[PDB]
Amino acid sequence: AIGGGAQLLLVFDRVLASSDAYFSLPAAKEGIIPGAANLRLGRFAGPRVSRQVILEGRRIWAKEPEARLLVDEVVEPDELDAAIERSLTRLDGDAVLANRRMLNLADESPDGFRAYMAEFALMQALRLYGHDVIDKVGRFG
Amino acid sequence: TDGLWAALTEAAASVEKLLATLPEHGARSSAERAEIAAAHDAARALRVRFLDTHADAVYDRLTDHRRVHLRLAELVEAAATAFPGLVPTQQQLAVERSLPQAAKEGHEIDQGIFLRAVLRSPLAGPHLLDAMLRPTPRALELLPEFVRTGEVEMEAVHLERRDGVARLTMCRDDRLNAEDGQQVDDMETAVDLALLDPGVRVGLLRGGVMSHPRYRGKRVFSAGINLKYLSQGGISLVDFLMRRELGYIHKLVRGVLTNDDRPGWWHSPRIEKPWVAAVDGFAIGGGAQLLLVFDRVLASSDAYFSLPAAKEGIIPGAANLRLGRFAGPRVSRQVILEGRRIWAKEPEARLLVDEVVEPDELDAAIERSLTRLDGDAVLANRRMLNLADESPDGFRAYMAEFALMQALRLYGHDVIDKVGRF
Amino acid sequence: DGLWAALTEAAASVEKLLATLPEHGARSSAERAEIAAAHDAARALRVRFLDTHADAVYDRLTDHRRVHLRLAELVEAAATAFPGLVPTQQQLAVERSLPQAAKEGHEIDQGIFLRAVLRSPLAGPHLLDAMLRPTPRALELLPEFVRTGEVEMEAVHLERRDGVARLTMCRDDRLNAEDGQQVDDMETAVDLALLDPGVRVGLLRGGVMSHPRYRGKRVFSAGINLKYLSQGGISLVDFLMRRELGYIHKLVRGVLTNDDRPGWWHSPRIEKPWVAAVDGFAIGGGAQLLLVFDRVLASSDAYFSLPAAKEGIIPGAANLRLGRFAGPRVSRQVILEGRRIWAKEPEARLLVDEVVEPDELDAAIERSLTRLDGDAVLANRRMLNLADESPDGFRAYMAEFALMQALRLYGHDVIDKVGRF
Amino acid sequence: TDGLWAALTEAAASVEKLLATLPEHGARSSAERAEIAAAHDAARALRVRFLDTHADAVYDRLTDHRRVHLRLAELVEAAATAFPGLVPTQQQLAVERSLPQAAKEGHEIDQGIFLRAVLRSPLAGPHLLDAMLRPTPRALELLPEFVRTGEVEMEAVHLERRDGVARLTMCRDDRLNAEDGQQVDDMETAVDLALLDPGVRVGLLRGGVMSHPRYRGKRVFSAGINLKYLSQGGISLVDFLMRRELGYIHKLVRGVLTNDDRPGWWHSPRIEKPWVAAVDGFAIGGGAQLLLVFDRVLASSDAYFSLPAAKEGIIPGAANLRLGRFAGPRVSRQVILEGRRIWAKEPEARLLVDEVVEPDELDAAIERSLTRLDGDAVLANRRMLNLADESPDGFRAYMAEFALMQALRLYGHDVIDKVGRFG
Ligand SMILES: CC(C)(COP(=O)(O)OP(=O)(O)OC[C@H]1O[C@@H](n2cnc3c(N)ncnc32)[C@H](O)[C@@H]1OP(=O)(O)O)[C@@H](O)C(=O)NCCC(=O)NCCNC(=O)Cc1cc(O)cc(O)c1
Ligand SMILES: CC(C)(COP(=O)(O)OP(=O)(O)OC[C@H]1O[C@@H](n2cnc3c(N)ncnc32)[C@H](O)[C@@H]1OP(=O)(O)O)[C@@H](O)C(=O)NCCC(=O)NCCNC(=O)Cc1cc(O)cc(O)c1
Ligand SMILES: CC(C)(COP(=O)(O)OP(=O)(O)OC[C@H]1O[C@@H](n2cnc3c(N)ncnc32)[C@H](O)[C@@H]1OP(=O)(O)O)[C@@H](O)C(=O)NCCC(=O)NCCNC(=O)Cc1cc(O)cc(O)c1
DSSP B192-245: HHHHH-TT--EEEEEE-BB-SGGGBT-B--B--B-HHHHHHT---IIIIIIHHH
Per the DSSP assignment, residues forming a β-bridge with B162 are B165
Residue C359 contacts residue B370 (beta carbons within 8 Å): no
Sequential DSSP letters for B52-80: HHHHHHHHHHHTTTTTS---HHHHHHHHH
Residues of C in contact with B42 (CB under 8 A): none
Asked whether the beta carbons of C363 and B312 are under 8 A apart, the reply is: no
- B223 annotated as ligand-binding: yes
Check pocket membership of C219 for ligand 2, CB cut-off 6 A. no
Q: Could you tell me which chains touch chain B, where touching means 3 or more CB pairs under 8 A?
A: A, C, D
CB B326 within 8 A of CB D329: yes
Contact C309/D378, CB-based, under 8 Å?
A: yes
Cα B212 to ligand 1 centre (Å): 12
The SS3 of residue C20 is helix
Q: Is the dihedral of CA B26, B27, B31, B35 positive or negative?
A: negative
Residue from B176, B232, B405 to probe ligand 1 pocket by mutation (most atoms less than 8 Å from CB) = B176
Alpha-carbon gap, residue A74 to B304, rounded angstroms? 15
Q: Which residue owns the Cα nearest ligand 3 atom 39?
A: D223
Amino acid at C30: A
Tell whether B325 lies on the interface with D, counting CB pairs under 8 A.
Answer: yes
- CB neighbours of C57 closer than 8 A, spacing ≥ 6? C50, C78, C81, C82, C85, C116
**No. of H helices and E strands in chain D?**
17, 12
Neighbouring CB atoms inside 10 A of B270's CB total: 17
Q: How many CB atoms lie within 10 A of CB D215?
A: 17
Q: How many CB atoms lie within 10 A of CB C160?
A: 19
Do B108 and B88 touch, CB atoms closer than 8 A?
yes
Where does residue D71 fall: left (phi above 0), alpha (psi -120 to 50 degrees), or beta otherwise?
beta
CA B395 to CA C18: how far, in whole Å? 54
Q: Does B402 touch chain C if contact means CB atoms closer than 8 Å?
A: yes
Residues of B whose CB is below 8 A from A19: 343
Q: In CATH, what is the architecture of B135-422?
A: Alpha-Beta Complex (3.90)
State the CB neighbour count (10 A cutoff) for residue C129: 15
- The whole-angstrom separation of Cα C234 and Cα C240 is 8
In this structure, the strands spanning C281-283 and C269-270 are unpaired
Angle at D188 between CA D185 and CA D194, to 5 degrees: 140
Which of B143, B147, B144, B229 lies closest to B183, judged by CA?
A: B229
- Each domain of chain B, given as residue ranges in start order, spans 1-134, 135-422
Q: Whose CA is nearest to atom 44 of ligand 3?
A: D308
C284 lines ligand 2 (CB under 6 A): yes
φ, ψ at A19 (rounded to 5°): -55, -30
Please count the helices (runs of H) and the strands (runs of E) in chain C.
17, 12
- D202 bridge partner residues: D165
**CA C302 – CA B378 distance, rounded (Å):** 45
Whose atoms come closest to the Cα of C406: which ligand? 2
**Strand bridging mode C156-161 / B342-343:** unpaired
Residue of B173, B256, B254 whose CA lies nearest to B216: B173
Closest-approach residue (CA) in chain D for B350? D330
Euclidean distance between CA atoms C225 and C418, whole angstroms: 10
- The reply to whether C379 touches chain B by the CB within 8 Å rule is yes
Q: What strand order describes the sheet that includes C295-299? A: C150-152, C156-161, C164-169, C201-206, C274-278, C295-299, C354-356
User: Pairing state of beta strands C295-299 and A22-23?
Assistant: unpaired
Q: Residue B307 to residues B284, B304, B390, C41, C368: CA-CA distances in angstroms?
A: 6, 11, 21, 58, 19
Task: For residues C41 and C19, give the distance between their C-alpha atoms in angstroms, rounded to a whole number.
Answer: 18
Q: Using alpha carbons, select from C306, C309, C316 the residue that is nearest to residue C247.
A: C316
B365–chain D Cβ distance below 8 A for any pair:
no
Q: Is C313 in the pocket of ligand 2 (CB under 6 A)?
A: yes
Q: Is C246 helix (H, G, I), strand (E, B) or coil?
A: coil
Q: Is C324 annotated as a binding residue?
A: no
| Cβ atoms of residues B118 and B59 within 8 Å | yes
Residues of B in contact with C390 (CB under 8 A): 394, 397
Encode burial over D99-127: b for 16+ CB neighbours within 10 A, e otherwise: eebbebbbbbbbbbbbbbbbbbbeebbeb
Return d(Cα B303, Cα C365) in angstroms, integer.
Answer: 31
Q: Which bound ligand lies closest to the C-alpha atom of D181?
A: 3
CA dihedral sign of residues A34, A36, A39, A43: negative
Number of neighbouring beta carbons within 10 Å of residue B259: 9
SS3 of D6, please?
Answer: helix
Alpha-carbon distance B329 to nearest alpha carbon in chain C (angstroms): 6
Instruction: Kindly write down the DSSP assignment for every residue of D224-291, as one continuous string.
Output: -B-HHHHHTT---IIIIIIHHHHTHHHHHHH-EE--S-STTTTT--EE---EEEEE-SEEETHHHHHG
3-state helix, strand, coil in chain B (%, to 5): 55, 15, 30
Write the DSSP symbol of residue B161.
E
Count Cβ atoms within 10 A of the Cβ of residue B233 and give its class: 0-12 exposed, 13-18 middle, 19 or more buried.
Answer: middle
The DSSP string of D330-375 is HHHHHHHHH---EETTSGGGGGT-SEEE-HHHHHHHHHHHHHTT-S
In angstroms, the CA B256 to CA B195 distance is 7
Distance from the Cα of D254 to chain C's closest Cα (Å) equals 14
Contact between C221 and C169 (Cβ < 8 Å): yes
Max Cα distance, chain C (Å) = 68
Q: Provide the resolution (angstroms).
A: 2.5
Q: What is the DSSP string of D283-295?
A: EETHHHHHGGG-S
Q: Does B418 lie at the interface with A, CB-CB under 8 angstroms?
A: no
Pairs across C and D, CB distance < 8 A: 103
Is B372 annotated as a binding-site member? no
β-bridge pairing B165-170 and B202-207: parallel
Under 8 Å between Cβ of D142 and D115: no
The answer to whether residue C315 neighbours chain D at the CB level (below 8 Å) is yes
**Alpha-carbon dihedral sign for residues C236, C238, C243, C245:** positive
Phi first, then psi: give them for residue A85, nearest 5 degrees. Answer: -60, -35
Q: Quote the CA–CA distance of D369 and C124 in Å, as a whole number.
A: 39
Nearest CA to ligand 2 atom 55: C285
End-to-end Cα separation, chain A, in angstroms: 20
Nearest-angstrom CA–CA distance, C2 and D99: 58
Ligand lying nearest the CA atom of residue B282: 1
CATH annotation of D1-134: 1.20.58.1300
DSSP designation for C324: H
Which fold would CATH assign to domain C1-133? Methane Monooxygenase Hydroxylase; Chain G, domain 1 (1.20.58)
CB-based contact D45:B266 (threshold 8 Å): yes
Report residue C333: phi and psi, to 5°. Answer: -75, -40
On whether A54 is known to bind a ligand per the annotation, the reply is no
Q: Give the integer Cα–Cα distance in Å for D68 and D401.
A: 24
B389 lies within 8 A of chain C by CB: no
D177 C-alpha to center of ligand 3: Å?
8
Residues of B in contact with D397 (CB under 8 A): 387, 391
- List, as one string, the DSSP characters of A16-29: EEETT-EEB---TT
Ramachandran bin of C175, using left for φ above 0, alpha for ψ from -120 to 50, beta for the remaining angles: left
Q: Which residue owns the Cα nearest ligand 2 atom 33? A: C174
Report d(CA C69, CA C280) in Å as an integer: 38
CA-based nearest residue to B328, from D386, D388, C328, C366: C328
B260/B257 Cα distance (integer angstroms): 10
Rounded to whole angstroms, the Cα distance separating C288 from C245 reads 14
| Chain D residues closer than 8 Å to C310 by CB | 375, 377-378
Which residues share a beta bridge with B278? Answer: B206, B298
Strand order from edge to edge, sheet including D275-279: D151-153, D157-162, D165-170, D202-207, D275-279, D296-300, D355-357
Distance CA D200, CA D165 (A): 5
The CA-to-CA distance between both ends of chain C, in Å, stands at: 48
Instruction: Tell me which of 3.40.50.150, 3.90.70.10, 1.10.443.10, 3.90.226.10 is the CATH number of domain D135-423.
Output: 3.90.226.10
CA–CA gap between residue D414 and residue D423 (Å, rounded)? 17
Distances (CA, A) of C210 to B414, C172, C183, C218, C359: 45, 5, 21, 9, 20
Angle between helices D376-389 and C391-408 (to 10 degrees): 170
**A61 to B302: CB separation less than 8 angstroms, yes or no:** yes
Task: Tell me the C-alpha distance between B160 and B166, whole Å.
Answer: 6
DSSP H or E segment with residue D14: helix D4-21
Report phi then psi at D65, rounded to 5.
55, 60
| Residue C388 touches chain B, beta carbons under 8 Å | yes
Task: Count helices and strands (H / E) in chain A.
Answer: 6, 4
Q: How far apart are CA D264 and CA C108, in angstroms?
A: 12
- Domain spanning C134-421, CATH class: alpha beta
